[model samples]
Target: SHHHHHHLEVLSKYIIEHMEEGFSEWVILEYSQILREVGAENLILSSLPESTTEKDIPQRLLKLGLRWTTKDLKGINEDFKDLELLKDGRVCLLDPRATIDLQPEDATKFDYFVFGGILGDHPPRDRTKELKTAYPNLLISRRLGDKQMTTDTAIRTTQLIIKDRIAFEDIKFIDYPEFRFNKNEATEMPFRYVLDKEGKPILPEGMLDLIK
Candidate 1:
């Protein structure tokens, strides 16, 4: 039953629903982080601004990114579902309100993993609820430890589970990471971050520069 090229990793589509009001600097930086973290080819963005709404930042952001497109999750699912290319159980959204936590088995259980790409608000809003009910018939919700994580962190966590076959419990994280810019100047982040081999949060290299 085994086939050749078994070493090849299964490609799963990761979705980011840009639920925020606009593509601000933070949003752009996070998207860049996601692009670098997961590779742009596997990423899909939805709920994007109109062709002229986001100004030129998104245009310049498109400079390194051209392969991915802005898509409506519901529309795509509706079309694909009717086409028999998608089944209700295969599409998933990562939601804090989900009944169960995401497991390593989910890496292969779902083909597309959707995340509500909202700003890391401190109090944390359940924006994911909208996306959870988006394609109610098709998209089931899953949780990752009931914490608020940066989009990149969530993606990496899922990647570790599915691509590297690592258990969620074994993953290292630093919650609410604080970025200290100076002796007295620092920024407190509200999201949980996955720890790197060097014990540093796996954020975009330019994140600090962006905030400054």
Candidate 2:
């Protein structure tokens, strides 16, 4: 698993670099597909040799290797298990780790992807191991990033379990209205024409009267 962690780090770094440049969805999809295809295990192992005794590899790297191998093998078998959950149609928001952004197709892979700030948090690629070391309770959710719990249900359940574990304070959920503007006015009007010699949209007949 440690090996997989390293591989994900490399892959996530590549993604963060491109995301900063505003890389297109298609570009990310193709790039990740290539990385997955190139054999993450071989890439991780290439730094060492078969003769490099397992004990010699650092404990962290060894865990990474094991995690990577296990995930890869399991992924092959479950293939579309995630998609199946979506198709089942109960899920409203399918929030995966932020690094899921590493695979752009994952954006479309589920109907709705949700991300929460509590319980399990995914740090940026560079900070992955550092955060993990600091938070020993942290668990890797999958190939993408660290996760404490697996299914959304488990995450929700855990929240309930620990609801009273911490001091109760004032917390609230909020909702707001959506702003809608006239699409035709926004898209069709040129700023110059919409304004007079000074500036402002000249109202059509009786527009001022309607305001009164």
Candidate 3:
């Protein structure tokens, strides 16, 4: 828990620094443009088979994200059917095999991937295909370990935008980045997660340790 808190603090610092450079403004604008170009209809389609009921669409999309990263079925199943109903008529877990690969300046694979267009018509679980079909703009890779805190915060914010704003333009600029932080010293710890023998969620190791 302390580590998680520290990570957030480091992330908060990075976000604040970016804020000084108008990161929030740029992000909001980007969100809007994404929505206008991509459209909610396309977004719903891109994620595919995942039903977008008039009542529960937004909630479902967010849950889909949780399912993707944490393998938490509770989020999706809290109100919906299995992954079969979400993707195809078959059970599909978030396949690491499907995760997109990143060519960062170094080894970390932290990145973003967007989906759209005719390529969007066929969604694959493969990393390479996902990156290809998904909008190139969606995929982002940043340095890790050294910059984990700030990078994680940035990634988390980006994920939030993708999850919520079906149309990117709907995002709003929040001014919570004016907080202070020490950049010279690493303020965040590394994230920690516990996996079962099968590498499934046996339990969380603790909160994400994302600070140095």
Candidate 4:
């Protein structure tokens, strides 16, 4: 698994280096979660605007054990032009509208993957278009599917694609049940118990008291 670990390390570096666009509260939290779960050597939150109201969660992340220093969390005045990997076209931008499909085979060609860190359904506000305009030739545009995916999902998918060396076709699936419930009556049975792998109840102790 050394090869896979190497790829993951590369992917982590890319994520830390280039995730500069759309620096909102939600985006920052998601990035921190991804970094925590995915494992990265370093993370730089660059290009922060003159002022922002989104510091609480990032501070929380730091208190919860993010090791990067205050200097690593840079501002808009900082420049990324000198980053050799970025200048050399190793950065791939993920766009829902891109014509090229992002396949497992394409993961190795880039050192970094950039995703819009926005958190809304507003299409016009999405950073992908502006990103494409800014680095038309410097970055590669690739799409996951016809529908848009959240920033976290896109990052995780990219990780899986690179780490597992597996195609989307291998992971995508559809499931069907033998019965269907009427929409009006569905809410009547809102709670359903689930079991663990060994078939034991998954709920915690004193579940009824906690709920009440």
Candidate 5:
């Protein structure tokens, strides 16, 4: 029933991020944006480096004193290989190889949304399948579509679908966006991004600074 979702439990859905490279600055930045987008309470960071220093948010949490998110990411961090997540909710992998388009009703249907947290790969070597094949049971999978989405875009989309029950196609996005930094320094982003109301791509605060 369309009305069934109104009385649903306080959602503790885990939007799982399952990979990182020794937890790079780029990874931290994107994860920070993920926290900002869907927030820390709903996200579960997994398969990150064990070294606490590298795993911490790249910068600025101390100033805002919102240090709990960093603590939460650490506490939430778990090895996907041994994750005991089934009781909390069912797992769904956001796999491009997946056949089904992410559905609006999926907001209520899944408990955990798994994604690969690697940096962009323009040609898409299907690196997500790296984690997919490991689980053995052929975990349930869904696609955002044929477009290449970065981790931030993927997680934010999942949040919109889960929190607002927004249809995937109805939401806005920008692909292969070009950033015009200055007179002769325009740069190209080789991945898709979520767009704001003004139709600009919503990116992490220091993205241009990082890329420069």
Candidate 6:
């Protein structure tokens, strides 16, 4: 068990070291944002296309003093070959279309997690099939849920499972409050609520109007 826990830590660190092949500029920004939130010790941009410019990356991140690297014109698999975790069967790729769901207990089962770095609702072309073909023995496939999630959301969920030392059952919602818009603000108070304790709006100002 102790050895397994040690592997988990190694896995966590390894993911930050080889995060690569983001297909879009926005996805890379989102990836960087999550890495910041999770307090990653390193950030590596691997297998970046030559067409990608420096401006594509978030400038805030560039100045944040993270240990980062950008490897241009390389393939993600090539980057993986450099990592011991990938050489072993310790790296799991998160795929929305995967047959297996990532369980809470899986936090310690693998050494690293890989998320598809594509923006919008679409995935990179043949990403899943290609990865499976390249690392048939080493790569494991796991899905977060039935529905697809953004790259950052997937990473955040994985981090919570690993760092909080919690189970899926613990975090799974048994019940949730129904949300509805109330037209009458004068007489009856509605369940409708917004803004956090910090006075910042929960939704963007432009989006708030649409809710009502």
Which number leads on lDDT?
1
Q: Per-residue lDDT for 10-52 in model 3, tens only?
A: 1100010011111242232322333333332222222323433
lDDT of 2: 0.26
Q: On a 0 to 100 scale, what is the lDDT of residue 105 in model 2?
A: 31
What's the CA error at residue 204 for candidate 1, in Å? 1.7
Better of 1 and 6 by TM-score: 1
Query: Cα deviation of 158 in candidate 3 (Å)?
Result: 17
**Model number with the top TM-score:** 1
* TM-score winner between candidates 4 and 6: 4
Question: Tens digits of per-residue lDDT for model 4 on 1-212?
Answer: 46653423232343332335434555556566666645544334433443433453366455544433222212211333323345446777778778987788786687667666455353435566766776666678787666555565566666667667767655452221112245443221122223335644223233322333
How many pairs of residues collide in each model?
0, 16, 21, 0, 0, 1
**What residue pairs clash in candidate 5, if any at all?**
none
For each of the candidates, the C-alpha root-mean-square deviation to the true structure, in angstroms, is: 6.6, 21.1, 19.8, 9.8, 8.2, 9.7
How many clashes show up in model 5?
A: 0
140, model 2: CA deviation in Å? 25
Better of 3 and 4 by TM-score: 4
Q: Which sequence of candidate numbers ranks them by TM-score, best first?
A: 1, 5, 4, 6, 3, 2
**What lDDT does candidate 6 reach at residue 139?**
71
Across 29-126, the per-residue lDDT of candidate 6 in tens digits comes to 55556656656543345434555566655565556533334441123344433344344557777776678877767877886776654442233343
Against the unseen true structure, what C-alpha lDDT does each candidate score?
A: 0.73, 0.26, 0.26, 0.51, 0.67, 0.50
The Cα error of candidate 6 at residue 18, in Å, is 10
Per residue, candidate 5 scores C-alpha lDDT tens digits across 1-212 of: 78874623233345444455555677667767777766554565555454555336455432322222222222443323223445323678888888998888987677678787777676888888876776646357889888888788887887777778899898898888888877898889988788999989988878768877
**lDDT at 157, model 4:** 62
Q: 1-212 in candidate 2: lDDT tens per residue?
A: 46543424322100011112222333223223323433233222211222445564345334433211112211322422222222222222222433321233332333322222122223324332332233233222212223322222222222222232321122121112122255542222211112233434333333233333
